[PDB]
């Protein structure tokens, strides 16, 4: 149902790959463990901070 | 915007799992589908557009 934002599935969630990062628990859980993950306590390294704005052709395209 | 064998859209196909394998999965299985958490939470008060590229740019990090 249309309760979420528009999300691309194409047909497969990891075609000869993986969905996100299927790996063993590093130090503990992620939920309710350390606040500010967005920007209030922005971590040194974990994501791709490659640009601040304009994701190519308004969603993805390069 | 591509049309060839094994296209870049086949990595970006992960976008449906990239968010839903937290908010509909940490309730059903332990924290193992995503060792990181910044990739999904980017959608909130940081960068609601970088997230859609990460599913191709760096699936794991």
Please answer yes or no on whether A19 and B33 come within 8 Å at the CB atom: yes
Kindly state the DSSP code that residue A46 receives in the 8-state scheme.
S
The answer as to whether B17 is a domain residue is yes
Please answer yes or no on whether B31 and A60 come within 8 Å at the CB atom: no
Can you give the residue range of the structural domain that contains B51? 9-57
Q: Which residue has the tokens 């332990």?
A: B30
Q: At a CB cut-off of 8 Å and minimum separation 6, what does A15 contact?
A: B10, B13
Residues from chain A contacting residue B41 (CB–CB below 8 Å): 37-38
Is B14 in CB contact (< 8 Å) with chain A?
yes
The answer as to whether B3 is a domain residue is no
The answer as to whether B47 is a domain residue is yes
**Three-state secondary structure along chain B?**
CCCCCCCCHHHHCCHHHHHHHHHCCCCCCCCCCECCCHHHHCCCCCCCCCHHHHHHHCCCC
Please answer yes or no on whether A49 and B50 come within 8 Å at the CB atom: yes
The answer as to whether B2 is a domain residue is no
SS3 (DSSP) at A26: coil
Total domains present in chain B: 1
The answer as to whether B18 is a domain residue is yes
Q: At a CB cut-off of 8 Å and minimum separation 6, what does B2 contact?
A: B8, B9
């Amino acid at each position: 149902g249309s309760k979420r934002w528009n999300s691309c599935k194409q047909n497969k969630q990891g075609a000869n790959s993986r969905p996100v990062n299927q790996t063993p628990p590093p130090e503990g859980e992620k939920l309710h463990s350390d606040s500010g993950i967005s920007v209030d306590s922005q971590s040194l390294h974990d994501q791709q901070p490659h640009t601040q704005t304009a994701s190519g052709q308004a969603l993805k395209g390069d | 915007g591509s049309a060839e064998q094994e296209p870049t859209a086949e990595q970006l196909a992960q976008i449906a799992a990239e968010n839903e394998e937290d908010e509909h999965s940490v309730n059903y299985k332990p924290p193992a589908q995503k060792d990181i958490q910044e990739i999904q939470e980017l959608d909130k008060d940081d960068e609601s557009l970088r997230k859609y590229k990460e599913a191709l740019l760096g699936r794991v990090a």
